[PDB]
Design a protein around this nucleic acid. Structure first.
Ligand code: MG
Ligand code: MG
Lengths: 202, 175, 191, 151, 50
RNA sequence: GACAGCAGGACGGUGGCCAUGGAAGUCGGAAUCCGCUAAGGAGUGUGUAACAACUCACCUGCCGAAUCAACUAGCCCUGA
């Protein structure tokens, strides 16, 4: 395989370039499968997101066909996890600023940036015992009526701090919102136009 | 065979005896590498007996001639095909040699098959010898000798084993 | 297959100087100097560049193991450059069982004295290499920092420490105790 | 809110779910009895039960799962009394009940509007998969209906 | 009990490949026994965990 | 724009179906498809008894042009 599939992918990208002459450059450096499902099924009625490897560098060959305006401007812009968002409707400058949806924020080891985790005096509300993680890290807790509360007010993960496995499990069980990060818009492309979105669009 | 010294290329043509049931034999032709023409004729009878219905008694050799080199002053590339018989089972083989003449390249082929694979002159049957040009050589050794403006010095070159006196005050250096 | 020349390329920064009298390489820099001998390899070591310092490690015909050897020279020259610009710092946290490991230094940080040693009464002494300085870290529990210039000397001293702290005649899946090399790095950071 | 994916009989042989429940301590027998009252005649087969709790009672909702209603479109009852003849009889037509089924399916499939759900629920079966006069390889390819009338 | 230090000690003592023939502690990503007492065989097995 | 190396993702139907001490990709028997897809195999292994976490197939970010697999026989080694 992977020859007829690549020819079909070239048919899909020439169909999108011939159908939708307007596009958004995005990046998905912090991505998830459930996140992409939520973004796609929220944007079924509008613009379509597409990704890929160096096969995305196909506008060069599409310009070597010479049937285009200056579409070759975005060729040095596909660097570092760059994907396309093909659109037809807009003509509208309120897209994705009212649709930048909040995503979980499920705790996973590895991230450092940007925020902190402050846990005030608040009960867990979980089943017995739910003190093993608190004893593994070290947190002054007190047992009230069965939900167990926390005496002090300490910070678990500071700015630039490595998330660990036990920290990830306790944040996933306590459901206190960890680091979440959606997609990034980088460049707008509307009919051969060179936008400078710092800050011109929207 | 023996492959004593350098080899020699022979063009040998041979036919069957003219019989009343079948006149005009097809008068076949080969290309035999051999140290001399007697070994060329015998190895010719060997190959033609293994190929077609021929034997030395009911046949004859018409011509057995030396084949001189078409361009002796040119460093050329030769692909040799081999039908050598190993200890377990026989194998085919393609080898490449950068050398001047055809007989010298086939000589290097016999010496190299004696060196590396321990094969005698009995087991080696040369299938085909073909001069190939540049940019078609498979082998990395001949492919890395394919270099215009090539450079290499000669490091640690020791020589003259007792051409000097056996008892000198020297202590000889290299290069 | 008797491969014609294999050469490795080394860029040397302006902070240090190099001098070769043959196969002996002498590198002088801010954190001392360091000299080594490559007498047993027979690979050409040439330099070029007027205040540009481009070293080349060049070997002619050789064999496959010797073509493997020609990269080892480039790697040890890179290690000498890193050791003379930044130095080597090895951090060793004392992974200790019920009995702690009391580590002191005696003779200018060159004699590491280990006590309580898995509960053994035998006080152990380890003499380090000429040219490596050790210290006990601050603001961190039972960390041992080995600082030096030559990576072979520093890491052999750390190997002597982590083999001096060894569980004997027991299971070593349980009793995970000893002083192991935790982090390898440089002295001067952000470089 | 408690979610559970089980069902045979009611049981209650000193074995139950409770874990989230005894934080408010209301279900120990009453929640199981109301689960019995909601599981009367529905059914003798594995279902999914979720109970919403707000401080006094349990509201029992059955979110129907796809393979569970595929099994529910078989012929009941088969609980005991000469079982095992053998496991996989399954002779049904399912020509429009599966269509109504994925009309009920909402916000959990990441679906096209009845586009390929015919293929999904035709190949997600294991006992039936077709009326006995054809082969399901024609179901996979030759369906050209539903995608206009269902949305 | 310092689980990070326990992971470090398991990194230096536990996660090794033991050969079934030469009985040598080698490396977790090893392929052959480096010792010449068996003939560099590829008959490896992980070091046993509980 | 491959092999490596480092980094990110590895879902929805579905806790699929036969089983019941549990099988919710991971003891087992059968099977084996679709959507989002850039990509997820009704799943290559590790684990908790299960539910969970980790990794791999697969895809992608940087680098940059050669690389990988299975056999075969010459020397030498283990077998000795
Ligand atoms: Mg014992
Ligand atoms: Mg022997």
């Amino acid at each position: 395989d992977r020859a007829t599939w690549k020819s079909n992918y070239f048919l899909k990208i020439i169909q999108l370039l011939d159908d939708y002459p307007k596009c958004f450059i995005v990046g998905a450096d912090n991505v998830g499968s459930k996140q992409m499902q939520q973004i796609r099924m929220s944007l079924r009625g509008k613009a379509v997101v597409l990704m890929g490897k160096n096969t995305m560098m196909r506008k060069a060959i599409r310009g070597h066909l010479e049937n285009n305006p200056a579409l070759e401007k975005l060729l040095p812009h596909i660097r570092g996890n760059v994907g396309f968002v093909f659109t037809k409707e807009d003509l509208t400058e309120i897209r994705d600023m009212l649709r930048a949806n909040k995503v979980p924020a499920a705790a996973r080891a590895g991230a450092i940036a940007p925020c902190e985790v402050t846990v005030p005096a608040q009960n867990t509300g979980l089943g017995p015992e739910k003190t093993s993680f608190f004893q593994a890290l070290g947190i002054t807790t007190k047992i009230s009526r069965g939900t167990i509360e926390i005496l002090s007010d300490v910070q678990l993960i500071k700015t630039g701090d490595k998330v660990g496995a036990s920290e990830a499990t306790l944040l996933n069980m306590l459901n206190i919102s960890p680091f979440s990060f959606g997609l990034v818009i980088q460049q707008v492309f509307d009919n051969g136009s060179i936008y400078n979105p710092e800050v011109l669009d929207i | 065979m023996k492959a004593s010294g350098t080899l020699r290329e022979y063009k040998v043509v041979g036919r069957c005896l003219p019989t009343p049931k079948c006149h005009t034999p097809p008068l076949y032709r080969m290309r035999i590498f051999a140290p001399n023409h007697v070994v060329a004729k015998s190895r010719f009878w060997y190959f033609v007996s293994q190929l077609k219905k021929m034997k030395k008694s009911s046949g004859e050799i018409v011509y057995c001639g030396q084949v001189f080199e078409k361009s002796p002053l040119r460093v050329k590339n030769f692909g040799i095909w081999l039908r050598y018989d190993s200890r377990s089972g026989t194998h085919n083989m393609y080898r490449e040699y950068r050398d001047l003449t055809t007989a010298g390249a086939v000589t290097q082929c016999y010496r190299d098959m004696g060196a590396r694979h321990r094969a005698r002159a009995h087991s080696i049957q040369i299938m085909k010898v073909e001069e190939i040009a540049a940019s078609k050589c498979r082998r990395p050794a001949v492919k890395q000798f394919h270099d215009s403006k090539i450079k290499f010095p000669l490091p640690h070159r020791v020589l003259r084993r007792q051409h000097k006196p056996r008892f000198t005050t020297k202590r000889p250096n290299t290069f | 297959m008797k491969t014609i020349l294999s050469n490795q390329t080394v860029d040397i920064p302006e902070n240090v100087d190099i001098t070769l009298k043959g196969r002996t390489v002498i590198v002088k820099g801010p954190r001392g100097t360091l000299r080594r001998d490559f007498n047993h390899i027979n690979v050409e070591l040439s330099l070029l560049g007027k205040k540009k310092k481009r070293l080349r490690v060049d070997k002619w015909w050789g064999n496959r193991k010797e073509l493997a050897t020609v990269r080892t020279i480039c790697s040890h020259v890179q290690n000498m450059i890193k050791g003379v610009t930044l130095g080597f710092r090895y951090k060793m946290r004392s992974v200790y069982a019920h009995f702690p490991i009391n580590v002191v230094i005696q003779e200018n940080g060159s004699l590491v004295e280990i006590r309580n040693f898995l509960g053994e009464k035998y006080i152990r002494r380890v003499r380090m290499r000429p040219g490596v300085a050790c210290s006990v870290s601050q603001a961190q529990k039972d960390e041992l920092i080995l600082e030096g210039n030559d990576i072979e000397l520093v890491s052999n001293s750390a190997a002597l420490i982590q083999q001096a702290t060894t569980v004997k005649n027991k299971d070593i899946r349980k009793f995970l105790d000893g002083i192991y090399v935790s982090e390898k790095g440089t002295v001067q950071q952000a470089d | 809110v408690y979610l559970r994916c089980t069902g045979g009989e009611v049981g209650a042989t000193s074995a139950l779910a409770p874990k989230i429940g005894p934080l408010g301590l209301s279900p120990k027998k009453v929640g199981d009895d109301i689960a019995k009252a909601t599981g009367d005649w529905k059914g003798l087969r594995i279902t999914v039960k979720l109970t919403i709790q707000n401080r006094q009672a349990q509201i029992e909702v059955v979110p129907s799962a796809s393979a569970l209603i595929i099994k529910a479109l078989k012929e009941p009852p088969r609980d005991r009394k000469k079982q095992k003849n053998i496991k996989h009889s399954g002779n049904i037509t399912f020509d429009e009940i599966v269509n109504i089924a994925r009309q009920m399916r909402h916000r959990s499939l990441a679906r096209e509007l009845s586009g390929t759900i015919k293929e999904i629920l035709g190949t997600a079966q294991s006992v039936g998969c077709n009326v006995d006069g054809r082969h399901p390889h024609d179901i996979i390819d030759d369906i050209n209906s539903g995608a206009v009338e269902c949305p | 009990i310092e689980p990070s230090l326990r992971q470090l000690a398991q990194k230096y003592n536990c996660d090794k490949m033991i050969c079934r023939k030469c009985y040598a502690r080698l490396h977790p990503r090893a392929v052959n026994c480096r010792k010449k007492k068996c003939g560099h065989t590829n008959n490896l097995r992980p070091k046993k965990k509980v």
